[model samples]
Target: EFNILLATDSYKVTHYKQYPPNTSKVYSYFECREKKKYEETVFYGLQYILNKYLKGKVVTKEKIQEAKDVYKEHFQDDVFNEKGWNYILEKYDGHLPIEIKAVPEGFVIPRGNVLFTVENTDPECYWLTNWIETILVQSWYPITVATNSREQKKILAKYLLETSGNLDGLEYKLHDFGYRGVSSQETAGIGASAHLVNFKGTDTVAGLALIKKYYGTKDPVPGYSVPAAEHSTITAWGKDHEKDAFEHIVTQFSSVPVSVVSDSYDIYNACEKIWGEDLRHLIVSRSTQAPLIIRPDSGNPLDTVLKVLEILGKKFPVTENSKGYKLLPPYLRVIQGDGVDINTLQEIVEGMKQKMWSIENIAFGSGGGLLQKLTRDLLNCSFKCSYVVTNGLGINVFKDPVADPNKRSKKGRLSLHRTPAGNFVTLEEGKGDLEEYGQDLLHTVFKNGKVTKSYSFDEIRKNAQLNIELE
Candidate 1:
């Protein structure tokens, strides 16, 4: 079940015989070829893949025999690399002889830049580099998620600055509600953890576990969630007792922030009569440290959120921030968890800003948009073999498809460097070694079946910090 040999495409199983004769080395690089959604890619999640699947003696006699049997039946031919498998198992004790160099996990590089490079360290294992491309290329998931989350943060920060004049509580503005909406637990973990690189709010426990286990997070976990209610918890209380349910939640979770889904039966009635009028005193008299977050989960997200904010603003005593934007009382707030994506989120915030409402008056929870809506092609991410050595002669290899110039790949040894003015550029075609190109940003992250370098979760978050210029 955990066979690394089977973790590849069937076509790759027969690639060992296809390389050029006397091929002593193979080199490949991973990058985002074009900027479709976001201009920059936030590099992340490679550490988790390396530590989980590639570390230690990943190959074994049992696994090799298993691959042989499966390939024999599936392909109906003896094309499996049984000899190469046995060679790695016996000569190197199943530890892959490969070197992986990558930019720091959280560094944000422009599209078309080299993110990571892989090459066989041993001449005997020349075919091993691209063989693992299937797994290494999965880094696109976390990178795309991180990029999307950071870009969303930029949008949120823009409104927060214009409305509140400061980035207070910015990390908690966009919560990760993506666990149940994701395809699998692993997807939730990787995508949600990527979102954590930009914001601290999340409801995905799998993401927390992954960061702690892989990124060496300790003491305070990077992702956090509050006591929040779902539709079932509120609907089960009966519609007639909606006010009672609201009172129970505030009373039960007093002294801490709690989110209650208000749109279960009637969002406006729940907000105006039940929460605003009936239980207004209960919410107002509570400790200002705790907040009652009203969630409107249905209807047009922009109009619904603006309406909820207006009703709550009228019911509660609204104050003006230093930026002249209206702020709801500290004990009360709103959360819109449905129909939130990059576009809808911007519309909601822009609407609130136009209404003179502080961005602090509400936070957001995203499910499908945050973790499931994106694809590998969002960033045009690809892993291509850039350089190889045949019979001790180094050759620059690339593809320049005439059909689509954008699909062209970088050739030869690649290195990433920053100019004196702090702009990143890919030094391709063997220019990376030149001193004029500045320092190479690519560092040895993994070598010879071991992680040579590691980044803590906090470190990665720090590296991912963005400088948001308000417009």
Candidate 2:
């Protein structure tokens, strides 16, 4: 029932007839036109698109007829390209005859650089290039999530280095609590996997599965989660037995790191009285080397976090890092999963820093803000036809809006090149020179019905690692 022909905007169905006469080939590039949140984008999710939607034998006569019938009523006219699609089914045997060249997945490039270029290899399928643009452009989901997660990591790393004098355990600092909070299981999986490009801690199992299925990572998955509690688990034990709930969970997962929701009743009481006072010995004498993470799921995140830190500090034996910032006991830590976004996260970190508490004292869990809150416009992602061929002639194509200069698109064939100084630029009008501009960063990843290149999850994570320290 999942027809590739219908996986686009309704208006896109009429694009075949709209192009110039005798248009034999169309070349388009996908790019983040401008930076909305971060200067650089972690190019991702295209591989998933290629494998799931564009792989071998994607088109069939049945799907074509289904699309034709839908468009007949949807548009009240026979504008559907039945003939073009039939040609693909007959000539290519349902395999799309197109070549897709892209920068390696997980490669970080500044905004406004082409991440991928697509053009039909068979001139008869010129319109096929942009036919899939709708699906390809949805790449903004993973790219934005990866960029946002990485930007968060850069900030978290800076704070960790400044306050704690090291980046130890940085990978597990930001946990993904976005599974239940996203729109679908696929969204959770895709977005969480994108976040895993920077961090390894996650409660989203779908993401782990996606990485294993799409990125070909196995054995120990790309991301992991610890036994964690929620309001349901704590409150179900009754308000009076909250202490028993905490004690049971701690005793159950004593040998490993576990996170418990402390704000089921009163957060301060749960932390100070239950975890700090009643179960102090149980926590301090745990056999595992991992810490027991305390979660505060309500109230002002910045204020609640600092207050929780102060309470935990007074009750536990705290140590000082090399930078003189106070570190909570190894057996205890805080995880603020509520009301966290990029802005609030920075504020909370600043708050801890001002209080002379090391960032190591706590970790983070984000849900809606991490995955659901983002939009395609966060990076101004666009897929535009930059170059085309018609009637045996190559033509450079672009849109220059008179009212909005930012909407202006690049013209002619494009190639991405990196300089010796480590700067990346897009050479337009086919001006990219291998001798002067170095090898083209865009390599053919897909042709005809086969994926020409693939990347493992580890490679993606390694490429996504930040090289420069944030100010």
Candidate 3:
């Protein structure tokens, strides 16, 4: 009944009136309780407040009135109490009052340390404390996407190193094909940008646009895509004109790479009969000019890639790398772009290794797996009040949920630091203090309703990679 009441009347009711008088400050922080399948949590979405709640604008009369009505309707408070819902709107004009200090977006936060902290910066603006988690909870999406992307990159990295002996083309190995599989254009933009932090290949044009909008970049900035044909384009060309469709892909671009989906009819026939026999001369002649990437859109991924590698390897001469792995001829390569996710990708890599095929011989693209197929619980993410100040006295607060001891929360204002051993440790603020004892990892990302820090895509990529190296 208590939990039910809070959920149905969350925006309306406050049952904590029994607290000490003058409970002016509440300090809370967010963390990944258990990473589960992920190696490390890639912290992101602290800028969510900038894009959504505030929309990069200061307080205005129109905005305040809009917010005030929603507050009044929720609490059904016609008579606004001095400490009521409208007080925050009336006090701050139209802006939020919480000061959100955070680990810079794109940093890797180890399990159980705070990713960012939220607290009321001004006592008079204490009504601000009531809604910090309400808005910030939306961070879960971008945060999960970013962390999931980084982990996927690490999994790919190890296999790439084993077969290629270097990480070249690492950025292009996993492409962001997940935009269409997501819920909205906004989600596509956000998830694609998160993916671009680790790679330079994406089919999500909106992902590129988002980098231009949020992180400050141009089109084809952090990630790039090639001219590729989809199922619609192939089917539009008609089954009889399959050869003509393949011809257009090769001729349309001069000195540029192209992808032609060969599965509209028979992928093997397209590769063996059409490409190997009928169009053999054109592909061979242009093989050295620019790479022609073949995409097989159907069939079992592991079987398709292996068979494609064999057919293409026989058609074009192969190169032996210094690592002693067989490389696909420059004229042809394959990308398994259908139904790929982290597990399937790893399985495909393992299958390639078993066949002694070079990891560089193929790449992958993902849709729902890279974007919409995740939940906050996948990483056990949550925000909890860890400390509070009532009438000018500090008090430690934490939850020891009896049902799940591992779900126990952290206590008091905390600081995250890298130990000499090269892992993060969250020290309570009441202890020796972060400044004197350790290198504090968290920085002032947002202050007084404004984002105080900005990071470039490359810089953030570097930060993520640096954190990846520690593992």
Instruction: Give the number of the best model, judged by lDDT.
Output: 1
Error of 3 at 251 (Å): 1.5
> What's every prediction's RMSD, in angstroms?
1.6, 1.7, 4.2
Better of 1 and 3 by lDDT: 1
lDDT of 2 by residue, 1-471 (tens): 578989988988888889899989899999999632588999989999999889899889899999999899999998899998999899989999999999999899999998999999998888899889999999999999999999999889989999988888899888888889999988888998899999988888888878888997645778777788888988889989999899998888988988899997799998889888998988888643667989998999999998999998999998997899998878888899998888888999998999999998889999898989999888999999999888899989899889888888988999999877989999988888435788889999899989999999888877888885322
Q: List candidate 1 segments past 4 Å from native.
A: 35-37, 469-471
Of models 1 and 2, which has the larger lDDT? 1
Clashes of each: 0, 0, 1
- Worst 10-residue lDDT window for candidate 3 reads 1-10
RMSD in angstroms between candidate 2 and the native structure over all alpha carbons: 1.7
lDDT on C-alpha atoms for all candidate structures: 0.90, 0.89, 0.74
> Considering only N, C-alpha and C atoms within 3 Å, which residue pairs clash in candidate 1?
none
Predictions ranked by TM-score, top down? 1, 2, 3
TM-score per prediction, in order, is: 0.97, 0.97, 0.89
Best by TM-score: 1
Stretches of model 3 off by over 4 angstroms after superposition: 1-21, 55-91, 217-220, 287-289, 432-436, 466-471
Give stretches of model 2 more than 4 Å off.
Answer: 35-37, 433-435, 468-471
Question: Residue 435 error for model 2, in Å?
Answer: 4.6
Models ranked on lDDT: 1, 2, 3
In candidate 3, how many Å is residue 260 off?
A: 0.7
